[PDB]
Amino acid sequence: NTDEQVTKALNLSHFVGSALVVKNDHVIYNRAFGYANKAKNQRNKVNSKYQILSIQKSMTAVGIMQLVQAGKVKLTDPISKYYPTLKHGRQTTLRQMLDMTTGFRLKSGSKEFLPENQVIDFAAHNVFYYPDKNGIYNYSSVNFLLLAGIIRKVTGQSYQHFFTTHFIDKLNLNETGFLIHGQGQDATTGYRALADQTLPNYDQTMPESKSQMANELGTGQVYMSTADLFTVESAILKGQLLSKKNVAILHTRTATGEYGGGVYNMSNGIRSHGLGYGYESSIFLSPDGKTGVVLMSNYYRKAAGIQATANKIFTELMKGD
Ligand SMILES: O=P(O)(O)OC[C@H](O)CO
């Protein structure tokens, strides 16, 4: 039985968070573990809200490809079309930004709590360009912040507004929003772990400021339940937000990396992973969007990482075990 096997693996790995497994469009596992907030004696629930972290980049990527489908941008466009003040790397294409094949990097945003337009301005003013990284896979979050700025510039909407109408409203997500406004009901607290810690003790929480949340524009500012994250990623692969032809164009790997169009592309599906602020998020999904695994945790432990567990579940699920 799948329930028995997955529960055993999650308990032996000391999982804290919510787990969802879907096979051929049917939920076969949906269970929560540990505490959303230990001091308040609030257990994690299947509908608890967790940080999606870098998995948000897959959504920013779809937003760019929606603009391509609508004739409003092209993947061959150079970044300098939208950021004319850049002094270097001006030829970098939107394609490369989506694939993490650029030389742009920004290790920190402003220490102030800024509105979106000023977060974009700060990044454009302060980003650095490494020519030796151009054209080769290297993970750099600023690419997706700058892509969120392109969404804003082309549409005349905030990224938050665009995300809300294109994902939250479109797919009737009821456990999704922006951390900066509060999670609301069924919220979770992120816990800080020691490097070698495997057992949860809830002895320290992980802080995150409004500045840090604003600076995650396009890149890791959203909370979701496991169900809402599955819904978004499956809807993308099913053609509900973007033609399947354009999903395939977007989700194309490069010569130097599986990453392309905001996800890692494999022979048997896609994967995305997030880590930050005490959280870890993991999705593996089949090419048709009908079979996959979502694990989200508010208690990240390097010595008990959840991606390896999700990878094992996914591999077995795709075989038939
Ligand atoms: O995005 P990955 O693949 O580097 O995994 C860790 C994330 O960057 C953090 O959110």
Automatic annotation (TrEMBL):
What this protein is called in its record is Beta-lactamase class C and other penicillinbinding protein
**Compartments where found:** Membrane
**Shown chain mapped onto the complete sequence:** 69 to 389 of 391
Q: What is its EC number?
A: 3.4.16.4
Q: Indicate which residues the UniProt annotation says bind sn-glycerol 3-phosphate 2.
A: E216, L275
Sites binding sn-glycerol 3-phosphate 1 sit at: S54, L275
Where exactly are the transmembrane stretches of this chain?
none
What's the source species' lineage?
Answer: Bacteria, Bacillati, Bacillota, Bacilli, Lactobacillales
Tell me which GO cellular component terms the UniProt record holds.
membrane
UniProt keyword annotations, A-Z: Carboxypeptidase, Hydrolase, Membrane, Protease
The UniProt GO MF terms for this protein read: serine-type D-Ala-D-Ala carboxypeptidase activity
Q: Which residues form the Beta-lactamase-related domain?
A: 18-301
